Coordinates of C-alpha atoms (C1' of nucleotides) in Angstrom, one line a residue:
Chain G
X1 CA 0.0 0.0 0.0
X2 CA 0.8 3.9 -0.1
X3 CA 1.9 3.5 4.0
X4 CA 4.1 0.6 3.4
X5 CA 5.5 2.1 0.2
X6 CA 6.0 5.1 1.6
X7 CA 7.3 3.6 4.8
X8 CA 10.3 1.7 2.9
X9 CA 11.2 4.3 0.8
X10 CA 11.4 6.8 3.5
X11 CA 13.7 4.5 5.3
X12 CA 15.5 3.7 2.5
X13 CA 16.3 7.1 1.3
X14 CA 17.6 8.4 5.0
X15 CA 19.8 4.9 4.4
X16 CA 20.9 6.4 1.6
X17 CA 22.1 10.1 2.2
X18 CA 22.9 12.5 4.1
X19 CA 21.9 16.3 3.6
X20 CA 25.1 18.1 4.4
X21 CA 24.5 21.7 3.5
X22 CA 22.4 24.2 1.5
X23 CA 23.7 24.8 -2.2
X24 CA 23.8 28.5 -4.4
X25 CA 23.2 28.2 -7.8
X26 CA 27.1 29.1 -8.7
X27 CA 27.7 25.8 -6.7
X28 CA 28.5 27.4 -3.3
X29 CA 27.9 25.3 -0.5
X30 CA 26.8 26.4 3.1
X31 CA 27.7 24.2 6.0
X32 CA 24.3 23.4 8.1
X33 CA 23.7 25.1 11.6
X34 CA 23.1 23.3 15.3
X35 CA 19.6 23.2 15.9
X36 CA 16.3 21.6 15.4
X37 CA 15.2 24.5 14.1
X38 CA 17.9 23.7 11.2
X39 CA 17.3 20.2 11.0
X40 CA 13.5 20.3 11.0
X41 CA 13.7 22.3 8.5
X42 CA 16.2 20.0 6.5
X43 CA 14.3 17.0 7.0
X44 CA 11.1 18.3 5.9
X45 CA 13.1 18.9 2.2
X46 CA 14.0 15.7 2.4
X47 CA 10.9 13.9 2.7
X48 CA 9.4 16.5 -0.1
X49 CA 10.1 14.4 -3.3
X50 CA 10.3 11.0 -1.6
X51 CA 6.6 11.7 -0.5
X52 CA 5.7 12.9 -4.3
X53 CA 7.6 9.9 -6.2
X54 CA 5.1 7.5 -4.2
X55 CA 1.5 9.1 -4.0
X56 CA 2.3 9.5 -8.2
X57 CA 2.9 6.2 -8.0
X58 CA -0.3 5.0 -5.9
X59 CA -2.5 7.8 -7.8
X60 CA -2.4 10.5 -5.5
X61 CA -2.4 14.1 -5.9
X62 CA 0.0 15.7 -3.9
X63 CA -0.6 19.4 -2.0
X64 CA 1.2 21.5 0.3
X65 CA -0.5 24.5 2.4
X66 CA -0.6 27.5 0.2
X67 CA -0.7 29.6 3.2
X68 CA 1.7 29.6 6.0
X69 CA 0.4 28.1 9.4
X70 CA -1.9 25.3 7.6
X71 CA -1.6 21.9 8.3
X72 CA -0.8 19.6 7.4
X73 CA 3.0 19.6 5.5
X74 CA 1.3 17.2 2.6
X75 CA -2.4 16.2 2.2
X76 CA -2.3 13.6 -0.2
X77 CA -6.0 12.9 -2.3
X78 CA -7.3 11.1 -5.2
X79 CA -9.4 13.4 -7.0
X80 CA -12.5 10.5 -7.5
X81 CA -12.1 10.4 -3.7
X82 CA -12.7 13.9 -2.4
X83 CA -13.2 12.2 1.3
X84 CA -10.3 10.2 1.5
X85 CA -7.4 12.8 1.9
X86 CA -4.4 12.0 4.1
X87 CA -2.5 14.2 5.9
X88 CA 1.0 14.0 6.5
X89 CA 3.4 15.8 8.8
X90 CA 7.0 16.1 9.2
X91 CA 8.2 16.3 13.3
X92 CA 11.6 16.6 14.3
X93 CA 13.0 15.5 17.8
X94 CA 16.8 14.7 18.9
X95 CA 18.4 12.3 21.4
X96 CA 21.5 13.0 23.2
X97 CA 22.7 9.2 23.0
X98 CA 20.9 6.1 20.7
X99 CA 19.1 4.8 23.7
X100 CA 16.9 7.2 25.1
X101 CA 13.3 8.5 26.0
X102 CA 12.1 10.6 23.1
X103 CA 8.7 13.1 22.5
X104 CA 7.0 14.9 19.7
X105 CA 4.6 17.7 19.8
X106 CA 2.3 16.4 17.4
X107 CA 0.2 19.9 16.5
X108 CA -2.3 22.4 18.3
X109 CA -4.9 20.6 20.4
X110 CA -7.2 23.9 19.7
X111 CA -7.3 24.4 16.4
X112 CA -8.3 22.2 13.3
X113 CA -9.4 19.2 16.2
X114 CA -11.7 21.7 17.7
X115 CA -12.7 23.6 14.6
X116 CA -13.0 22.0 11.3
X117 CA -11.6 24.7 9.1
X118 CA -9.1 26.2 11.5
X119 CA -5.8 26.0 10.3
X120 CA -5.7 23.4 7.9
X121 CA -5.3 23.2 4.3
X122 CA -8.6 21.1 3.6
X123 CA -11.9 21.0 6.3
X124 CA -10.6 18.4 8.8
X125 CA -13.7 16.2 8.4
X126 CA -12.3 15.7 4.7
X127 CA -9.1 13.7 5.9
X128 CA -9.8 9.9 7.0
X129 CA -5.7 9.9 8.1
X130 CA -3.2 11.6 9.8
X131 CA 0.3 10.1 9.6
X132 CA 3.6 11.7 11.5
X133 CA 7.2 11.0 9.4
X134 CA 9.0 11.4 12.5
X135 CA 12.7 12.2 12.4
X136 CA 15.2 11.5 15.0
X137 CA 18.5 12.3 15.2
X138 CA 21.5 12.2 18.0
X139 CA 23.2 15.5 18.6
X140 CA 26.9 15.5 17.6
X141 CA 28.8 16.9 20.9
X142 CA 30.4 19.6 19.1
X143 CA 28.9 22.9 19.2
X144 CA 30.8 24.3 16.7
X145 CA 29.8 23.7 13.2
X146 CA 32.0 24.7 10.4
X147 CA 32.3 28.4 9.9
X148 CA 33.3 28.2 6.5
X149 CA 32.2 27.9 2.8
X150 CA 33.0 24.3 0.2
X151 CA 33.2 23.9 -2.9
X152 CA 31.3 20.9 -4.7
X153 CA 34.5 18.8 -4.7
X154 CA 34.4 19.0 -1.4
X155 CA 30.9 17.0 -0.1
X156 CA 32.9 14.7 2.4
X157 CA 34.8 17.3 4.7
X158 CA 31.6 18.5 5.9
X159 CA 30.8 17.8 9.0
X160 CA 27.0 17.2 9.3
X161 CA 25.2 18.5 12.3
X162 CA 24.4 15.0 13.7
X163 CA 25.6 11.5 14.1
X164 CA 22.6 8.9 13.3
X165 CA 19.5 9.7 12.2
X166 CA 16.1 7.1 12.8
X167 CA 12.9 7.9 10.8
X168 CA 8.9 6.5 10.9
X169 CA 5.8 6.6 9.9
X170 CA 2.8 6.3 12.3
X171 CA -0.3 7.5 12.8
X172 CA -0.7 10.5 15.1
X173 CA -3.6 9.3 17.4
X174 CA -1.1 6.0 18.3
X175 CA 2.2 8.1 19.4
X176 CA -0.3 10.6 21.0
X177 CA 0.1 11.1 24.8
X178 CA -1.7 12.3 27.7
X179 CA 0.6 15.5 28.6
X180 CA 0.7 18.6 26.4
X181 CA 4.0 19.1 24.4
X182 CA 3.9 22.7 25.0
X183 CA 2.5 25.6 26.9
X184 CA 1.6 28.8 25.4
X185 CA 0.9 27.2 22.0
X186 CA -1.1 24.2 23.0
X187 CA 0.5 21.2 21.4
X188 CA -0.8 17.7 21.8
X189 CA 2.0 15.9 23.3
X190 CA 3.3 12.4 22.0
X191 CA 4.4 9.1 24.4
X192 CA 7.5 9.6 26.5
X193 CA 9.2 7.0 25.1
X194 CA 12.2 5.0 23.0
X195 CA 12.4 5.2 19.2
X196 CA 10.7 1.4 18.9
X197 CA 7.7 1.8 21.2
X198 CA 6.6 4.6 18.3
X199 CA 7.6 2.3 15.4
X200 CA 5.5 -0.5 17.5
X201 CA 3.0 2.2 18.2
X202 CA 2.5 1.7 21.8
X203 CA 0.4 4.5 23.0
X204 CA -1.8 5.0 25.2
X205 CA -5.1 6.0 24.1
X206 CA -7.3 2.8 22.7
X207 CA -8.5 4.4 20.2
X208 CA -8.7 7.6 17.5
X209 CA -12.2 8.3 18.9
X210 CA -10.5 8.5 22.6
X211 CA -7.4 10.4 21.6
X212 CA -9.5 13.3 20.0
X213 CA -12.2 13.0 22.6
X214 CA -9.2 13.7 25.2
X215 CA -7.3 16.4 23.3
X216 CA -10.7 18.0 22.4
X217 CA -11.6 18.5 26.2
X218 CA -8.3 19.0 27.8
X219 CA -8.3 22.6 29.3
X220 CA -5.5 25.0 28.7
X221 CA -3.9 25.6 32.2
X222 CA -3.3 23.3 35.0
X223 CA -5.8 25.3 37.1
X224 CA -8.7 24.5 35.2
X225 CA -7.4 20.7 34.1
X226 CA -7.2 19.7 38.4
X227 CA -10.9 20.3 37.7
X228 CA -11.5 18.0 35.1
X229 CA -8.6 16.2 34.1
X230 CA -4.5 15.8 33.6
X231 CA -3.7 12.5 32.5
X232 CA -5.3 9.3 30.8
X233 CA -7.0 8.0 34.1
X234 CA -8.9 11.1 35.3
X235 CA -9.9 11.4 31.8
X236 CA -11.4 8.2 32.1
X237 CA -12.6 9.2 35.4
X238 CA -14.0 12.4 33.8
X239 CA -15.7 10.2 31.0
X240 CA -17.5 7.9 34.4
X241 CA -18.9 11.5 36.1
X242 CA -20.8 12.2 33.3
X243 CA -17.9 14.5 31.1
X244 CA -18.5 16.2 34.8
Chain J
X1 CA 34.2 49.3 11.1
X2 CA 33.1 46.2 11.5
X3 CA 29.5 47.1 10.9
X4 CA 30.5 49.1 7.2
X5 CA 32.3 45.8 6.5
X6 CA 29.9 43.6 7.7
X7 CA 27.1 44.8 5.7
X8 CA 29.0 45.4 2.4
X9 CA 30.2 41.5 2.5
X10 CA 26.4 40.5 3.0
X11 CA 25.1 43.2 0.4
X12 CA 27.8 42.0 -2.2
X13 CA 27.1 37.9 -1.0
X14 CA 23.4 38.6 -1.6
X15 CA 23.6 40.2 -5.0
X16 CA 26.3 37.5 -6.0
X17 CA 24.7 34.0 -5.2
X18 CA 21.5 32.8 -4.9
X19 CA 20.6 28.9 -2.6
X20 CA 18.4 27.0 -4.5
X21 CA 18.3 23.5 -2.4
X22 CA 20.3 21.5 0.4
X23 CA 22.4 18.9 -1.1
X24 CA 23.5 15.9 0.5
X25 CA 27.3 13.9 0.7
X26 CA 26.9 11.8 -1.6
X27 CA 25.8 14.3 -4.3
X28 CA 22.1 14.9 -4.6
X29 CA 20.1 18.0 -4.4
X30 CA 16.8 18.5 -3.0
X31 CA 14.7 21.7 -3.9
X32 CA 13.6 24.8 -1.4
X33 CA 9.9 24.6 0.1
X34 CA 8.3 28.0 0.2
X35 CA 7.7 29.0 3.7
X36 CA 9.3 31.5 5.5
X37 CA 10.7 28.5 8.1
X38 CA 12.5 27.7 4.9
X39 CA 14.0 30.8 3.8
X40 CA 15.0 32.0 7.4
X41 CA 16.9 28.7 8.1
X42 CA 18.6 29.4 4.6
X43 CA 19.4 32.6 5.3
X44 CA 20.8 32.2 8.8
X45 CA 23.1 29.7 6.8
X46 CA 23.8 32.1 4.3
X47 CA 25.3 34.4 6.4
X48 CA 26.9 32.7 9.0
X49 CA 30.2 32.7 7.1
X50 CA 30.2 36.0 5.6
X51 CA 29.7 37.1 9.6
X52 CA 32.5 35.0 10.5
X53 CA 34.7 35.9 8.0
X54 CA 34.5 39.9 8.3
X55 CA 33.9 39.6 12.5
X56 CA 37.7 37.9 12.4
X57 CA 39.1 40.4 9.9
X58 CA 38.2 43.0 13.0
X59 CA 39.9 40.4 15.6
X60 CA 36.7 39.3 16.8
X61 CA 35.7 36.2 18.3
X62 CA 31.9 34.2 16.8
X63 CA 30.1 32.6 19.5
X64 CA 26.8 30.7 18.1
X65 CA 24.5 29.8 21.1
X66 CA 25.3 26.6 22.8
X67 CA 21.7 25.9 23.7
X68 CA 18.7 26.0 21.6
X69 CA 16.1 28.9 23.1
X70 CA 18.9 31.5 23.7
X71 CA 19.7 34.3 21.8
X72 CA 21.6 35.6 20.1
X73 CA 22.4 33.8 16.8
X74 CA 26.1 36.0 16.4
X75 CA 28.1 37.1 19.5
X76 CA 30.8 38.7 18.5
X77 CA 33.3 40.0 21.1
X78 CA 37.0 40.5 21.5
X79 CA 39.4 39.2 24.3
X80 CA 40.0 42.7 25.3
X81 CA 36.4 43.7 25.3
X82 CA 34.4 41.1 27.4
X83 CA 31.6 43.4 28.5
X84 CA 31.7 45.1 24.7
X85 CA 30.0 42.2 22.8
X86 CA 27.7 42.7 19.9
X87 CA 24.4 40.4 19.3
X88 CA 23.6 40.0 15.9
X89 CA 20.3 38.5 15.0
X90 CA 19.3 36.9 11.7
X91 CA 15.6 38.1 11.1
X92 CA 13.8 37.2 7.6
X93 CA 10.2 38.2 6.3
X94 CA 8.1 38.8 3.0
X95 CA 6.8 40.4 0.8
X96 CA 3.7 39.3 -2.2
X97 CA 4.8 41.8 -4.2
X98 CA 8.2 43.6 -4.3
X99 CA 8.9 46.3 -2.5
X100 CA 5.3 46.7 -0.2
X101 CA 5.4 47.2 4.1
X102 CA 7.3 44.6 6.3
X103 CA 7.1 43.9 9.3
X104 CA 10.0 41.6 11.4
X105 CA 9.3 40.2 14.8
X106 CA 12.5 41.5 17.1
X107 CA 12.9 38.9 19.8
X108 CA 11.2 38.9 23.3
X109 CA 9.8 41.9 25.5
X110 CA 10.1 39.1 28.8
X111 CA 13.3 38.0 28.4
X112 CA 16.8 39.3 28.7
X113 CA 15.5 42.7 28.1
X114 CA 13.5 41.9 31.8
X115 CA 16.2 39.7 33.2
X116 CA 19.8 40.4 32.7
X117 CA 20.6 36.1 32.0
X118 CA 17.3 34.8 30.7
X119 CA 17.9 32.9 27.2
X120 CA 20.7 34.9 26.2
X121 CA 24.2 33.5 25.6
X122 CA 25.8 36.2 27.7
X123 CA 24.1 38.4 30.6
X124 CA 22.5 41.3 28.4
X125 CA 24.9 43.9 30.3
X126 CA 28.2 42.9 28.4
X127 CA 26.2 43.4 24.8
X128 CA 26.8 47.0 23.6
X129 CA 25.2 46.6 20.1
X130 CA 22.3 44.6 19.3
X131 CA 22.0 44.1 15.5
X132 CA 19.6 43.1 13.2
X133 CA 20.2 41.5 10.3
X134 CA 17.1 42.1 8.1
X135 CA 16.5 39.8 5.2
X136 CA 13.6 40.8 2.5
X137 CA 12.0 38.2 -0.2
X138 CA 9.3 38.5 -2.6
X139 CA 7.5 35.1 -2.4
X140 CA 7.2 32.9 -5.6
X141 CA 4.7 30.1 -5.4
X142 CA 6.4 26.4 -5.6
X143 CA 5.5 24.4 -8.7
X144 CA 6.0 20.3 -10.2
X145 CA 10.0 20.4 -10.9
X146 CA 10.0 21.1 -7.1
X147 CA 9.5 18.0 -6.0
X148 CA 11.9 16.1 -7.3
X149 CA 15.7 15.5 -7.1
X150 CA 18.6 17.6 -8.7
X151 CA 22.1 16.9 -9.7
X152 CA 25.3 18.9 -9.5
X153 CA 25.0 19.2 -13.4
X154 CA 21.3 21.2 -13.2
X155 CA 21.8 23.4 -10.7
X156 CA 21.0 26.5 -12.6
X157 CA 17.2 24.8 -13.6
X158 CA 16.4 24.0 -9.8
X159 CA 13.1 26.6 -9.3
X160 CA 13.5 29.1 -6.6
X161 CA 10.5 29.5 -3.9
X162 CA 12.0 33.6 -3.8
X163 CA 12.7 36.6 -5.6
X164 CA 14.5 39.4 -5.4
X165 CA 15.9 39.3 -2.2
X166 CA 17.4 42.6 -0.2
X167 CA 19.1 42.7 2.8
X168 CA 19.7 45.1 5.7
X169 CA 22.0 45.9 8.8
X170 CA 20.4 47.9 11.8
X171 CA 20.2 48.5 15.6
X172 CA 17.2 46.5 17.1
X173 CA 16.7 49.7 18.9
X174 CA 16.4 51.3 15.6
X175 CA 13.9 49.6 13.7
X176 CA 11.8 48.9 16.8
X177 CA 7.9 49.6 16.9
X178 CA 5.4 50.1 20.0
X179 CA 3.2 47.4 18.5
X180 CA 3.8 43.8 19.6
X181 CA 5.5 41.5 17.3
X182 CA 3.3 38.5 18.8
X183 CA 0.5 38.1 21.0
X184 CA 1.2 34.1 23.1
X185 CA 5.2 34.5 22.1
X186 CA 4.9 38.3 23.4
X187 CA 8.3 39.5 21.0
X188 CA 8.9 42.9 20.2
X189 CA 7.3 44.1 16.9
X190 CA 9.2 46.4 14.6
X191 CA 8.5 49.3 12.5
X192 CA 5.8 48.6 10.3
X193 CA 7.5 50.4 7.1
X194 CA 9.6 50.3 3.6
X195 CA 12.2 48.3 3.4
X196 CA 14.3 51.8 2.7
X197 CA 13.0 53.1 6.0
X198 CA 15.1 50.0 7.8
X199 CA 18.5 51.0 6.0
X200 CA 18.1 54.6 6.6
X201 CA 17.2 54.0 10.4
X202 CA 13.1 55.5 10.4
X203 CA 12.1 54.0 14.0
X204 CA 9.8 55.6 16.6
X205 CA 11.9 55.8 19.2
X206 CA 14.4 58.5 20.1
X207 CA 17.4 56.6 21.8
X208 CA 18.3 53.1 23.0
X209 CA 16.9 54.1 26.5
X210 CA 13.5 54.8 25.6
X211 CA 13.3 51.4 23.6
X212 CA 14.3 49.6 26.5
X213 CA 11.8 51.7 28.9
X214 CA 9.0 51.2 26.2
X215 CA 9.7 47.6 26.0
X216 CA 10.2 46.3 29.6
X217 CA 7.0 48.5 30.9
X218 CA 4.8 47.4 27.3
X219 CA 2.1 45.3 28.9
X220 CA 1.4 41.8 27.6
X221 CA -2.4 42.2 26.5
X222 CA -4.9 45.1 25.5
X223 CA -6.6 44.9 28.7
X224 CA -3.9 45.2 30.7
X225 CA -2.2 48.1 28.2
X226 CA -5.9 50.2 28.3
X227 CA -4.7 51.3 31.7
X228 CA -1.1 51.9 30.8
X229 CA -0.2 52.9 27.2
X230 CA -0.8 50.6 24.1
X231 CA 1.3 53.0 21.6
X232 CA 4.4 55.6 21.9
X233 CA 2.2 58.9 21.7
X234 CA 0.6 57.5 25.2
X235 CA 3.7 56.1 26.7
X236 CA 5.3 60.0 25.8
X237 CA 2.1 61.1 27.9
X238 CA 2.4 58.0 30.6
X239 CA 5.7 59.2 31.3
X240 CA 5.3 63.3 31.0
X241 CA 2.8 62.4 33.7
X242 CA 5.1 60.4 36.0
X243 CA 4.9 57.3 35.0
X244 CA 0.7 56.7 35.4
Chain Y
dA1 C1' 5.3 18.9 34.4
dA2 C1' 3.8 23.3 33.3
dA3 C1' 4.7 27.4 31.6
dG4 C1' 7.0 30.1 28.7
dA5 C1' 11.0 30.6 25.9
dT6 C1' 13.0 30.2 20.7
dA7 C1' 11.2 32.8 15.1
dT8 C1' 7.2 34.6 12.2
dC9 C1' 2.6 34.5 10.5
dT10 C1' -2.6 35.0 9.9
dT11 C1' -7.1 36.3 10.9
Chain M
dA1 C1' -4.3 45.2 16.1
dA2 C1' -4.6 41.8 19.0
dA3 C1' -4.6 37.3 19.7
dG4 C1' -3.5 33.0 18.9
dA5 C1' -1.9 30.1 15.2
dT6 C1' 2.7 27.5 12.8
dA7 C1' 7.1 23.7 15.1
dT8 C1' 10.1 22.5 19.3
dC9 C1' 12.5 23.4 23.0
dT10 C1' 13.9 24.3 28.3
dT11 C1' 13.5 24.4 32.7

DNA sequence: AAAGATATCTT
DNA sequence: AAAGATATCTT
């Protein structure tokens, strides 16, 4: 299928390279920067054609938002199937060292999953999937990126901003968690947990119906949340007093 | 001076090369998306090296920020000079049509302009200068050849999601507004102007001090600013009054 | 964790 | 505009 295709060709192309720097047309090339902020940003180029050589191939139109501050990064749609759209989105996330606890912020929980037309490219009720290509890469200890400008003969003396890179697809209701992944700009979080666990998709909502349910209700500040609910349990406990 | 230098190496870079993808180790290029995430990560990249290269011609040393969430992006600072550094800040925005108002977002009003250490590299007291390094593009929509690969070989054909950039050098202090920049992320919002009016200096305020007083007194929402002063005109008056 | 930083945009 | 969206990070 499209998921598995695209699931083995997005492995298969991070087996393959490694983006090392931004190019001018007069064949200048840029050394990358530190951040996530860089490599998010990277990453999301990356996935750009890989993403367009397979819906092509499984009959898929593919469109990005037109407008800054839609989602989702691709909504992919078959024009017989209007309905069917699926929505993909790029996250980044690092690791200090290949064995430990990762999390995503996997989008607002206020606007397109409380408003159907809210910041999104297409009415939410139009996509029946929402995949995450998550990216995750381990810091390389230095903090001090080369300063300096290559030539095209010179690809392998640049050092690339991380050491290992590990990248999946899964559905975002699956890797969804309980705590938001930010504050001020109310981001569902993902699991706290290892690389595998969101290949495996061990989450812990049971189903889609819960996870939007949950981020659909979940209040703002922890104020009004001790009221109602924080985690998984006293959302469950909330759903038992009657959404009371 | 290291400023006249600064900004004729980034002038003379900008009019001289133009990044049209990030390419990876082993060769292959992969085209530019069209959002201003994009185009500020490319030009942060961009002019890293021009900043390094005219900061050591002028003895000075380049710090980038060791964690992510910290500003500046360029410290530059002699041996001699500890408590003389200079913040530079990469700042990039858009324009539909060429040449119409901008607008830049100029880093917190809560931050290290409220506390001397928070999520700056350096307590705020050793930075003299605080520049911005304003980066203009006219937006040009992405279209089918941008989705695919490149090669070394078609570097020129690789479709650009930008035209005619410009490029500007300027105290924060300088270009600064009295509207906010943001409303959650409560930044600093510039002069809403020409691009002409950032190079020649056309702010609202008349010294550094009144900036700073303007800034760490600007409340964080309408309600709270009715009271106080929501624009320069009634922070004059809030101030010839005594400060209520 | 929770709350608010990091940069910039839309409505 | 003001306010809250875009993504991710710290602390």
């Amino acid at each position: 299928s499209l998921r598995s295709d695209l699931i083995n060709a997005l492995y298969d192309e991070n087996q393959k390279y490694d983006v090392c720097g931004i190019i001018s047309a007069e064949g200048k090339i840029y050394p990358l920067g530190s951040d996530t902020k860089v490599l998010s940003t990277i990453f999301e180029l990356f996935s750009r054609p890989i993403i367009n050589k397979i819906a092509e191939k499984h009959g898929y139109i593919v469109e990005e938002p037109k407008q800054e501050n839609h989602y989702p990064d691709f909504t992919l749609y078959k024009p017989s199937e209007p309905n069917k759209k699926i929505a993909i989105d790029i996250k980044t996330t690092y690791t200090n060292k290949e064995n430990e606890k990762i999390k995503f912020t996997l989008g607002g929980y206020t606007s397109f999953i409380r408003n159907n037309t809210k910041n999104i490219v297409y009415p939410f009720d139009q996509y029946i999937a929402h995949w995450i290509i998550g990216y995750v890469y381990t810091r390389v200890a230095t903090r001090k990126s080369s300063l300096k400008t290559y030539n095209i003969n010179e690809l392998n003396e640049i050092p690339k901003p991380y050491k290992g890179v590990k990248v999946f697809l899964q559905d975002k209701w699956v890797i969804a968690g309980d705590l938001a992944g930010s504050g001020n700009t109310t981001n569902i979080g993902s699991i706290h947990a290892h690389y595998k666990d969101f290949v495996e998709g061990k989450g812990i909502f049971d189903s889609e119906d819960e996870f939007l349910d949950y981020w659909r209700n979940y209040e703002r500040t922890s104020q009004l949340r001790n009221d109602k609910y924080n985690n998984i349990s006293e959302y469950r406990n909330w759903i038992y007093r009657g959404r009371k």
